[PDB]
Design a protein around this ligand. Structure first.
Ligand SMILES: COc1cc(NC(=O)CCl)cc(OC)c1
Lengths: 300, 237
């Protein structure tokens, strides 16, 4: 079990760790988060009390280093940093635990939610979508635009998701115009899976990361990417059976975790109705269709 | 964006553009089978691709053999239309290729966009005007060449005959649309008006009769009456 200590909490802020969150008051004696499960990526995120504009946060993996948070009064935000001196870090943490100034990652033992939302998400892949090679952790916020959004403006602060465009020469083989547009299997299986992602695990990892950035930061380009990656699978007539079964599980847990009150903005009516009721895979997503119908029947 | 009643005058500027109408590509007769079920029989069709500035018509005849053994023909028809329009553009010299293609039905947008990916600078546009190009098969010489085709064929016409020698493309298009709007509403009466007077003939190299300027005014007016007449017969006004 790993720990992310905080130097201090000088401004009132709502702090998230994965799907959990808690409020810290201005100058409250808060010194971090303990008992964080090893084996998963994690995200620690922030919304200031005085300006809910800009949710921001950091993706990290405690196996890759010792990380802590410190407020910067000049740039006005909570920054993640790496401590290289390992005995300095252990001594800081042990002292903060002895004084019980830390919240405990509050995982229920029965509960596999976070695993199920991050099953295929890897830090190494995150660091290629979010490019800042001098850090082992990755900053994301509400406002960051994607490479594709920038094509349709600061490239260093962009989310470099894989570009998917159904009316593109990459998507459409010369001479198979109708075939490839109406059945996207060659774009899914040859162009994207064999060519770009190499395997379905990496495809699912980017899909899951895009969903999480949409949900935790309200990042609009991430929501676009999540729906595009769902739509590319649902609009393919030929999909490996193992990917369909896994996709159904992935989406089930995403829809289950989505705040009931954010559905209006994080779910695209067209994509979901097409995917569940019109597409080739309209009958292959039983778990996802059942939770959607019981939880969001208005959208449909 | 969409061409409408606000910006329809762009039709008569000097940027090359084509209208594409697909309403006569897939044509069928519906009939009963010996068992009393219903079946369709396709007949030859055509793509109606028109330069509104010059009158040049690229009539691509769609022979019934293109449908043999194919499913979902109404959907295929849109993709075949887009395939043939893309082939036409590629066949034209660069300086004759259009800058814009306006489709008369919005269901042609995605098929044509996908077939024209190699031409990113050619704009594919819809239109909000409910135009009458479906009535092109009421022009006897166009219907005749479509029905007689025994294989795929492209036939070139000028749908304005020699009118541009005397009137502007705006006025010529106005004359063509009025004629087509009337053949579509009452074909029998429309053709009666056009041929009633045996002394006015259609030249071998033309589609419409050789009316003087003053006779076109009379013809135009008789077409304005027919449309209105039928409008009253229909709605009881
Ligand atoms: C609606 O598209 C049009 C229609 C007309 N005129 C008529 O339809 C007279 Cl029945 C003329 C025109 O551009 C000259 C554009």
């Amino acid at each position: 079990m790993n720990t992310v200590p905080f130097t201090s909490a000088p401004i009132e802020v709502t702090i998230g760790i994965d799907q959990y969150s808690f409020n810290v008051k201005e100058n409250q004696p808060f010194h971090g988060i303990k008992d964080i499960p090893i084996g998963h990526v994690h995200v620690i995120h922030f919304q200031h009390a005085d300006n809910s504009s800009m949710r921001y946060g950091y993706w990290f993996d405690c196996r890759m280093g010792n990380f802590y948070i410190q407020y910067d009064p000049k740039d006005g935000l909570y920054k993640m940093m790496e401590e290289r001196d390992g005995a300095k870090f252990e001594n800081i943490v042990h002292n903060f635990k002895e004084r019980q100034m830390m919240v405990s990652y509050p995982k229920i033992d029965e509960d596999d939610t976070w695993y199920n939302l991050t099953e295929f998400v890897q830090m190494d892949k995150i660091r290629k979508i979010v490019r800042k090679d001098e850090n082992q952790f990755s900053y994301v916020d509400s406002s960051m635009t994607t490479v594709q959004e920038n094509e349709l403006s600061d490239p260093a602060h962009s989310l470099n998701y894989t570009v998917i465009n159904f009316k593109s020469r990459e998507a459409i083989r010369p001479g198979h115009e109708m075939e490839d547009f109406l059945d996207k299997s060659y774009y899914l299986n040859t162009v994207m899976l064999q060519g770009i992602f190499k395997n379905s695990s990496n495809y699912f990892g980017e899909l899951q990361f895009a969903f999480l950035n949409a949900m935790f930061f309200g990042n609009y380009g991430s929501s676009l990417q999540w729906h595009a990656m769902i739509e590319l699978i649902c609009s393919s007539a030929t999909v490996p059976k193992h990917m369909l079964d896994k996709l159904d599980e992935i989406l089930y847990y995403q829809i289950k975790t989505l705040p009931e009150q954010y559905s209006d903005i994080l779910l695209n009516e067209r994509v979901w109705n097409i995917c569940l009721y019109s597409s080739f895979q309209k009958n292959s997503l039983h778990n996802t269709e059942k939770i959607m119908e019981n939880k969001y029947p208005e959208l449909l | 964006g969409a061409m409408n009643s606000s910006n329809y005058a762009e039709l008569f500027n000097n940027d090359i553009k084509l209208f594409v109408d697909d309403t006569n590509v897939y044509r069928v007769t519906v009939h009963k089978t010996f068992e009393g079920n219903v079946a369709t029989k396709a007949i030859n069709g055509c793509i109606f691709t028109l330069n509104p500035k010059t009158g040049h018509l690229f009539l691509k005849i769609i022979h019934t053999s293109v449908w043999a053994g194919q499913k979902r023909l109404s959907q295929l028809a849109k993709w075949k239309t887009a395939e043939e329009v893309s082939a036409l553009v590629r066949s034209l010299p660069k300086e004759e290729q259009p800058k814009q293609i306006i489709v008369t039905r919005k269901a042609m947008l995605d098929p044509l966009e996908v077939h024209m990916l190699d031409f990113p600078n050619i704009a594919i546009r819809p239109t909000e005007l409910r135009l009458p190009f479906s009535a092109a098969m009421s022009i006897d010489k166009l219907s005749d060449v479509v029905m007689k085709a025994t294989e795929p064929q492209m036939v070139l016409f000028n749908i304005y005959d020699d009118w541009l020698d005397r009137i502007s493309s705006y006025t010529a298009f106005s004359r063509l649309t009025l004629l087509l709007r009337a053949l579509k509403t009452n074909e029998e009466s429309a053709k009666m008006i056009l041929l009633s007077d045996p002394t006015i003939t259609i030249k071998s190299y033309h589609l419409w009769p050789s009316f003087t300027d003053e006779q076109w005014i009379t013809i135009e007016s008789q077409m304005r009456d027919l449309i209105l007449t039928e409008y009253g017969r229909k709605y009881n006004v």
